[PDB]
C-alpha cells in the first residue's frame, strides 16, 4: 500500500464484534512515519520544539 | 461528557444524582453481549459490575462506605431491514430468585458476577445436586426473575430500544437506598435488566446476531472509611 | 506561547547557499571568468522552503563568501587577490573575455572584494516586473499559432523570473602560479509576503520545473496496528 | 524526533459495536484519517529538514 | 564592604573553555570535518562551578578562538582559510561528508570565520524545554514495563539536556599542503538564576553523571592538636 | 493531622507545599530499620518509597503526571543513658554513584528499591562480574554517595536527632523540580539520607540496637493523565 492511494484507506468490515484495534498510532507528529509527511508533520520537521493540542478527524 | 470520557435520556424518578472519587468516576465500557434470535435477556448489578474498573474499583474496595449514581448508555445498532425491540429496566433492589428448595441460598460469588452479569432463562429449572449445589440465580424472563410479571416491569425506570426508531438508550439513576450511604461490597443499589420485547429478525436469515454494548459512568461519588483493601472471596 | 518564530519572516530569515561560482587566476583549460544566472533552483533547501507557496514578494540580501587556494605545492607565493562581481541585468552586454571592455561597468552595479575581508554583502528590493514573484507558472511564453511550422516555447518558462547574471573575475593580473577561487552566494529574503500555500515537495527535484524522475517511493513501511 | 522522555502517547481505534449492513450492500468499506493542529499550537528553534536532500 | 563580586552573575561572568574541536584542511587518516555535541561536561572547572546548584536559567555566550598550523616544514604556503561552524539542532540532518548538501545551511544557523580575525562570538537565550536546566536528574527516560524483554535507558540520561551539535569544517578547497586547526569554545552564562545549592564536587569526575572511581581520599593528614 | 492519620519541624527552603488525590495523601509508615553501632546510613527516594502505599500508589501508577510535597517524620527513641546522633537530609535530585566502570549503569529496579530503600557503605567496592553485572548503587557515606563531602551535606534541608536532646525529626519538603509536574514513575523528586554523625553507644554493651521508623505523608497532591495501569518491571 505504501506510495499508492491505498495507503490512505483503512478498511472496515461487517464481521462480528471484536476487541482487536482497528488502528494504532504514536503521538509523535514529526517522527512517526504515518504523521511525518502530512502538512503538520512537514511543518514540524523544520522546527525542533513543538507544543499544543492536535485534531484527528475520521471520515 | 464526564471526565475524559465523551458520549432519549430518562432521569429515573425525575431526580438527578446529587451529593449528600472524582477522577475515578467516568464512563466504563463493559464486555459486549450478543443479541440472537433465541436470546432471553441479560442482567447486571451496580455497583457490582464496575468493581474492576480502574480507580473506581480501587475506591470501592479501599473504603467501608460508598455511594454513587449512574449514567447507563446501551448501544445497539442495526440496519433499516432489521426488526426487534429491547426493554432496558433499572430496578432498585433487584433481588433475583434462586434455584434451590432452600430459600435465599444463592452464594455471594454468583450474586456478584461482575461486568459479565447473567442471563435470563425461558423456564424455571430446579437444581437437584445436593452434594454440590450450584447456589446460583434462576431468573425466569416472563417472571422478571423475581416472581412478578415482566409486562409490569415498566413501572421501573426504563427505556425501549426499537430497532426501527433508535439504537441507544440512556438512563440516569440517582443513588437510591434506605440509607444515605452504605457498603458497596455488601449491597447492590441498582440492577439493570435487558429483555427482548420483540425478537430480533432479519430477512431470510436464521443466523443474524447483533452486539449490545453497555457504558456506565458513576456520578456524584462519595467514599468514606479508608482502611486496608477488601479482597472478596472468588469461586 | 507565541508564534514569533513561525512567522513567514522568521521562517525565511536565514542566509541559504544558492551557488558556488568557480574562477581561476592563471595565465591565459582554465576559466578566467564565470557567468552565473541568478536563481534559487540550483539548490534544494531554499527552493523547497519557498515552494510552500505560490506567490511571494520580498527584498533580497546577497552575501558572498570567497575562498581560494594554490593548485601546486611550493610552486611560489601570490599577492592578495581582488575579485570583481558585476551584475549583468538582462539585455546588458555579457563579457566574452577576462579583459573585455564590459568590465568598465559604467552603468552595471559592480562589487570589488579584497580577499581576507569579511564576506561581501549587498541588498536589492523587490524587482519583479509582475506584482509578485511566481514560483509556479502554468503556461507558455509563446502560444503556437496555426500556420506556424513545427511558437515552440518550453512549458512553464517565462521571462517573469529572468533577473540577469553575475560575472565574476579576478582583477589582479595573473600570477606566475595558478590559483583557484570559489565564491559561495547566500540568499536571505527580507520583508516577505507569501500567497497560496502548496504541499511541500515529496520527491527529488528534477530540473527547474515540477518534473520528477526518481525516488518516487518516499514513504517507509509501517504496520497499521503497530504504534 | 523520537525521544522517550518527550513521548506523546497512543491513539487507537476499536469497534464499540460492529458494523452492520443489510443485504445487497457492500460489506467492506474504507475510513480516512486527517490531522491538524489546534489554535494553541506553537513551534520553536528553526532547523533544516531531513525530508529533502541533494545528490 | 559590599558583596558585588559574589553575586551569582559575577561568579559566572567568565568565558570558560569547554571544547577543543580539531579539523584538518587536506586532500581527501585526516578529518575534514568534526562534530561536537554541545555540553559543559567535557571540562571540569565550569562544571564544578555550575554543580554548586541543582537548577539554573541563563543565556549563553559562545566565543570561538581559532588557531592553525602547517604540518610539515617548507612544504609550501597556504592562502587564508575560512571556517564554517554550523549549529545542528537535534533532529536536523548531520553532515556525513565535507561537501554534502547539509552545509547549504538554509535553516540551520551558521557562522563563517576568517582566520586572523578576532575570535568569533554569538549569543543564545535560555533554550531549555523545561522551566530550568537540570544539572542533576534522578530518574530515567524510559520506565521498563513488565512484559518487556531484558525500557533499558541509562540512569540520569534525559533529553532535557540535548541541545544539538556543532559541525565544523574548512570551507576552502584543500591546499597542496596539510593544515591543522583547533577551535576552542568558551562559554559564558549571562543573566543567571540558580536554585537548590549542593555541596561541591570533592573527587575527580567520572563520566557525565555523579559516578566516582578514583582519588577518593582527597583530604590530607593534620594532627588534631596542631595549629 | 493529615487525613485520618495523626502525629523541631523544618520547612525546606522556607516554602510550604502548594498546588500549581486527597484521601490517598496521608501518613504512611515504612518498614523500621535497626540502628546498630556499625551502621553506616540509610537512603530512600520519593515518590519511589510510597509506590505501594494504598491509594497513593494506585494514583501514581494510573496517571501519566503527578506532583506532591512531603512531610517526613523520623522517630527514634532511647534512654538517657544512650548516646548518638543522626543527620536526616532531604536532597533534591539525589543521584547516587554506581558500582561499575560503566557510567550510569545502575538499573531501574535497583534505583527504585521502594520502602526498604538502601544503605550506605563505608568504602567503595567496584563490581567486577562482567557476565552478570550487579548494576547497583555503591554510595559511600563520607562521599555522601555522590562524590561530595558528607560534612557539607548540611547545605541541604536537614534535621539532627541528638539522642540526649530529641527523639524525632520533621521535614516539610515542597515539590521541587525544573517542571511544574512530571512523571512520578520516571523521576524521583526527593531523596532522604540518614547518616550516623555520632555512633550509637550504650554503657558496657557492644550489642545495643535501636529502631528508626519513617512516616511520610504526601501533600498538595495532583495527578493528571488517567490511562491504563503502569506495571513497572521488577527483578
Ligand atoms: C554589484 C554586485 C551584484 C549585486 C546585484 C545582485 C543582483 C540583483 C538581484 C537580482 C535577483 C533578484 C532576486 C531574485 C528573486 C527570486 O529569484 C524570485 N523568487 C524568483 O521567483
Ligand atoms: C551558528 C554558529 C553556532 C551558534 C549556535 C550555538 C548553539 C546554540 C546553543 C545550544 C546550547 C544551549 C546552551 C547550553 C546550556 C547548558 O548545556 C545547560 N546548563 C545544560 O544543563
UniProtKB/Swiss-Prot annotation, chains B, F:
Subcellular localization: Virion; Host cytoplasm
Annotated function: Forms an icosahedral capsid of pseudo T=3 symmetry with capsid proteins VP2 and VP3. The capsid is 300 Angstroms in diameter, composed of 60 copies of each capsid protein and enclosing the viral positive strand RNA genome.
Subunit structure: Interacts with capsid protein VP1 and capsid protein VP3 in the mature capsid.
Name of the protein this chain belongs to: Capsid protein VP2
Species for this entry: Poliovirus type 2 (strain Lansing)
